[PDB]
Amino acid sequence: NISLKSKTNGSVIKLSDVANVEIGSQAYNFAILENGKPATAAAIQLSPG
């Protein structure tokens, strides 16, 4: 719903009109698949001693 000002005509337009907003990933470089399906992982390091 953010509002921008159009220079061509001066009308008020919304950010959605000129772009698509969504919730995604900061980076798309890597992907993890568990048996061919989306997955995530975390490695646990043993504490010394």
Partner 1 sequence: SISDVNNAIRENNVEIAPGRLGDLPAEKGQLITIPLSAQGQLSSLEQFK
The residues of the shown chain that bind partner 1, judged by CB under 8 A, are 24, 28-29
Q: How far is the CB of 29 from partner 1 (least distance, A)?
A: 7
Helices (H) and strands (E) in the chain, counts: 1, 4
Nearer to partner 1, 25 or 35 (CB): 25
Q: How far apart are the first and last CA of the chain?
A: 55
Q: How far is the CB of 31 from partner 1 (least distance, A)?
A: 9
Q: Which residues contact 32 (CB under 8 A, 6 or more apart)?
A: 38, 39, 40, 41
Q: How far is the CB of 28 from partner 1 (least distance, A)?
A: 4
